[PDB]
């Protein structure tokens, strides 16, 4: 009927020193990347009958969650944004300066608002079934307070109809912004594959 997926552009990510992507044994998606690096994202979807000719928009959020507040709740909670640290905020030269992340090389027109949480909204057109763009993180795990460092950061996207109703969603279950993405990615893969 209808589905949506978010993934990194594998071709480029495949052997990059700056980022790495993997799937868990449970098929959830994991991304590790350095801050200040362009991560190539591709959002794809298939729509049902009633939306075939709909004008749609795509919302992009970057939130945190833990065992106490699950992913489905967190991604739609306007108060769950991952917060940029003080020093990266004031040192920021991309507007809005306090956003943890930015969208570049977007094939689609986009706008930004923090009203209901830091969100980039891609304006699309009837018939669009994919959205390509780079996302770049301007703060990192190392910057956060121990309690926040323990929470999981999540990149979530929502496909909305003309009336603003979410009709599909997808996310990268865990995103980590670290110094050596290949170290963490490798440890993750070995631990997963060890699982008989
Ligand atoms: Zn920072």
> Tell me, what CATH number does 141's domain have?
2.60.40.720
Total domains, the chain: 1
State the distance from the centre of ligand 1 to the C-alpha of 40, rounded, in angstroms.
Answer: 21
The sign of the CA dihedral 122, 125, 129, 133 is negative
Q: Measuring CA to CA, which residue among 70, 52, 17, 66 is closest to residue 185?
A: 17
Element (H, E) at 71: helix 71-74
Q: What is the resolution of this structure in A?
A: 2.1
Name the experimental technique: X-ray
The sign of the CA dihedral 140, 142, 146, 151 is positive
Domain that holds residue 194: 1-196
Q: Measuring CA to CA, which residue among 11, 82, 20, 59 is closest to residue 167?
A: 59
State the distance from the centre of ligand 1 to the C-alpha of 89, rounded, in angstroms.
Answer: 7
For the sheet with 130-137, list strands across it: 3-8, 39-46, 130-137, 101-104
* DSSP letter assigned to residue 115: B
The binding site for Zn(2+) consists of 85, 88, 139, 143
* Ramachandran assignment for 20, one of left (phi > 0), alpha (psi -120 to 50 degrees), beta (any other): beta
* Ramachandran assignment for 105, one of left (phi > 0), alpha (psi -120 to 50 degrees), beta (any other): left
Q: Give the burial string for 33-51 (b: 16+ CB within 10 Å, else e).
A: bbbebbbbbebebebeeeb
Based on its alpha-carbon atoms, the radius of gyration of the chain, rounded to whole angstroms, reads 17
State the distance from the centre of ligand 1 to the C-alpha of 139, rounded, in angstroms.
Answer: 4
State the distance from the centre of ligand 1 to the C-alpha of 83, rounded, in angstroms.
Answer: 9
State the distance from the centre of ligand 1 to the C-alpha of 176, rounded, in angstroms.
Answer: 13
State the distance from the centre of ligand 1 to the C-alpha of 7, rounded, in angstroms.
Answer: 25
């Amino acid at each position: 009927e209808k589905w949506m997926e978010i993934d990194v552009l594998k071709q480029k990510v495949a052997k990059s020193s700056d980022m790495a992507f993997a799937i868990s044994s449970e098929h959830e998606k994991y991304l590790w990347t350095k801050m200040g690096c362009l991560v190539p994202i591709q959002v794809k979807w298939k729509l049902d009958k009633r939306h075939f000719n709909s004008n749609l928009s795509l919302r992009i959020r970057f939130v945190k969650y833990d065992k106490k507040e699950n992913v489905e709740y967190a991604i739609r909670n306007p108060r769950s944004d991952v917060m940029k640290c003080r020093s990266h905020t004031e040192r920021e030269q991309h507007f809005p300066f306090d956003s943890f992340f930015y969208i570049r090389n977007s094939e689609h027109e986009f706008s930004y608002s923090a009203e209901k949480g830091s969100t980039f909204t891609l304006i699309m057109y009837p018939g669009a079934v994919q959205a390509n763009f780079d996302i770049i993180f301007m703060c990192q795990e190392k910057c956060l307070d121990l309690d926040d460092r323990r929470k999981t950061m999540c990149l979530a996207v929502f496909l909305d109809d003309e009336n603003g109703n979410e009709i599909l969603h997808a996310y990268i279950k865990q995103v980590r912004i670290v110094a050596y993405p290949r170290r963490d990615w490798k440890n993750f893969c070995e631990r997963e594959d060890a699982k008989q």
